[PDB]
Design a binder for this molecule. Structure first.
Ligand SMILES: CCc1nc2ccc(N(Cc3ccccc3)C(=O)c3cccs3)cc2c(=O)n1Cc1ccc(-c2ccccc2-c2nn[nH]n2)cc1
Ligand SMILES: CCc1nc2ccc(N(Cc3ccccc3)C(=O)c3cccs3)cc2c(=O)n1Cc1ccc(-c2ccccc2-c2nn[nH]n2)cc1
Lengths: 399, 386
């Protein structure tokens, strides 16, 4: 009798029609669907719950099922006439009506405000400011090898991953400016969508390599790079496959705009939205932060286990300052984004059903995304512009 | 006691050191290797069998094992001190020790230079004074022609460098500059070839302005970043056994075999594997959309000619670049210690200057394959769409 369970009854029986052999299978499935459609029409969605029945958005909700039951009756007509392929063709029009629901009541469509209502002129400006500043500081990192170590190889790969990540900012600023109207074709929606995720993870995984490398340099003062570097680009490539698979241009009917969305299976759209959001947290923040934090306290342990003289005290704390800066910068730049992503996942799970909260997440998200790119501006100062001085202060305490 | 069986004993124990947990495993393996190295030093190879022991090539053979036993003793020193990762690092230098002119080539290089330069001259000059800066696909054509033109412009250098039996007479600064200029325009060519296949595919699957202002700089940016490890490692170094100053890939000598194997894999993945994935997927992507549309009359002749133009861009790229990357992958396996037979290593050396020429020959194919024959692809794609 629940709305979510009735859509499951509608989508499971819609699959039966596609793989049906005889007209009796189609008729049976459509009879179950007509019952579920009328039962779902009586239900009230979790979003716009405390809403009057005479309201236009509640009258539109029940109207959607009048269209749906009408399409079911046209397919039932054909099934009873013994017209299987005709009924299966008529039943395929139910998907168009089902998609008009998932982009309205299932999501923050008929909940949170439209992009036109939440458009700030500062966002495209801020995105170009971080683009030119971040692009020029990573140009220094790369050209610094020309005018002048296994660790240096990870620096270059980090600078390349950062420099290609920041190179996508002119696209998102343009896409935001045209109120989410993708004017580059659906092919570049998959390609640059994947290219973004590829270099984002390549940045985060090479940050993780640096902490493991600096830790292994502290605990053990004393071919690995020629296999770890291709492997880091391999894992970033595999982590960016769900982006290539689901990113696609789809027309948002109530906005009349072609948006580069995450075109998930409509029959399990909330499940996928919640699932992929958890993948972002675990794979992009939780797991790399476990490594970065463990390597910090791992280094912090060994420096409090060597010597405590006054001359070697200054040298010890400056190594710890460089060590605490790589963990704090990663948290400040990526924690706001993953907090909003975890809250977003709870909204798809049905935990958060407040449009006030969901609206906060929507307007905060373009800013939280910018801090993620801002981490690529910080990396030159954390690793390249310190690596030359971190090495001599680590050899001083070791002697 | 056989030389082949002693090298098998040396290679099997190297696999033990890599996967060793404790210093005793490393010490045990190196003790078996020191025995196998001294036993192999006493053996005479099948080649240069009927050769005097006082001969320089016989003294060099036994000298190679004196270097090999030396590195084993340096590793045994660390293993006995309880330095596992240090001993495993020292034992990896044993691989470097284990791995240890045609007049037609400079002529052929100048033939491809003048033919390729003149075919890209007709394309560059066409776009400016006899056409215009309109259309999006035409912008990639011009950038491809510029990248090809500048790539073919380096052929007089490699022909001269080959003529002086690899004696770089231009200074170590131009070894880094033209070395990177070569790689820059090589990747700029391959990446704009990749753009063309993605553009033609997007024109087929979606028959219905901004994208060009962003992609052209992004492609040249990725070309500059791909040619940086070239600028950092290419340098002039004296090759003692040839007595010549060669413009080589000056990797750290203590870590030369790992770097040579690593950068060879970079060439295959970034310069052939990844771009070929795009070119092949866009071909079968186009091939899919045309075959699902039922053609049978005049439209069938129109459909197959579009497929002929489509199959020509993937086949030309494979014919011109696959020989080079096959030899590069085999070269990488030789540095990894996979390929031990010097006969196939000698084949790579003489087959490499020819395989490099086919790479430049792809820049002779691109003007015909996209600007000239590719102009009909525009008219014949709108005919099947209508
Ligand atoms: C800082 C890096 C970053 N830049 C972005 C730039 C733009 C946008 N936006 C929204 C936007 C548009 C214009 C201005 C401002 C915002 C988009 O619409 C598009 C994204 C990809 C193609 S279009 C989102 C992001 C954005 O979420 N991130 C972070 C991030 C987190 C997680 C994943 C991820 C991990 C695992 C599996 C799948 C994904 C996954 N998420 N979205 N696609 N793929 C990818 C990226
Ligand atoms: C067709 C394009 C091409 N022209 C070349 C012209 C000459 C030579 N040769 C050998 C030679 C000399 C004289 C006559 C004939 C051959 C050289 O000694 C020099 C090369 C660069 C400065 S000197 C090699 C090549 C050659 O390998 N290639 C292909 C190629 C493949 C891969 C990379 C590459 C990718 C990623 C990272 C690094 C590199 C990288 N390899 N060498 N430096 N940088 C660059 C180029």
């Amino acid at each position: 009798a629940d709305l979510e369970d009735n859509w499951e009854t509608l989508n499971d029986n819609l699959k039966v029609i596609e793989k049906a052999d005889n007209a009796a299978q189609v008729k049976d499935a459509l009879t179950k669907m007509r019952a579920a459609a009328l039962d779902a029409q009586k239900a009230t969605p979790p979003k716009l719950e405390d809403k009057s029945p005479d309201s236009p958005e509640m009258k539109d909700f029940r109207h959607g099922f009048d269209i749906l039951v009408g399409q079911i009756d046209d397919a039932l007509k054909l099934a009873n006439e013994g017209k299987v392929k005709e009924a299966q063709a008529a039943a395929e029009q139910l998907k168009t009506t089902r998609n008009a629901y998932i982009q309205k009541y299932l999501g923050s469509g008929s909940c949170s405000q439209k992009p036109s209502d939440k458009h700030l002129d500062a966002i495209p400006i801020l995105y170009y400011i971080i683009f030119v500043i971040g692009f020029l500081v990573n140009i220094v990192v790369v050209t610094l090898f020309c005018c002048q170590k296994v660790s240096s190889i990870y620096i270059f790969n980090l600078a390349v991953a950062d420099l290609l990540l920041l190179a996508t900012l002119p696209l998102w600023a343009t896409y935001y400016s045209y109120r989410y109207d993708w004017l580059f074709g659906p092919v570049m929606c998959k390609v640059f969508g994947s290219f973004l995720t590829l270099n984002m993870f390549a940045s985060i995984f090479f940050i993780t390599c640096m902490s493991v490398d600096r830790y292994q340099s502290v605990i053990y003062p004393f071919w690995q790079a020629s296999y770890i570097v291709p492997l880091v680009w391999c894992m970033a490539c595999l982590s960016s496959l769900p982006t290539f698979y689901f990113r696609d241009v789809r027309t948002i009917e109530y906005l009349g705009v072609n948006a580069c969305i995450m075109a998930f299976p409509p029959e399990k759209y909330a499940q996928w939205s919640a699932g992929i959001a958890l993948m972002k947290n675990i794979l992009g923040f939780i797991i790399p932060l476990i490594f970065i934090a463990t390597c910090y306290f791992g280094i912090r342990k060994h420096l409090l286990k060597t010597n405590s003289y006054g001359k070697n005290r200054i040298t010890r704390d400056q190594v710890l300052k460089m060590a605490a800066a790589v963990v704090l910068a990663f948290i400040i730049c990526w924690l706001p984004f993953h907090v909003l992503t975890f809250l977003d996942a709870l909204a798809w799970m049905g935990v958060i059903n407040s449009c006030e909260v969901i609206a906060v997440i929507d307007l905060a998200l373009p800013f939280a995304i910018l801090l993620g790119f801002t981490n690529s501006c910080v990396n030159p100062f954390l690793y390249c512009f310190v690596g030359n001085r971190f090495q001599q202060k680590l050899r001083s305490v070791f002697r």
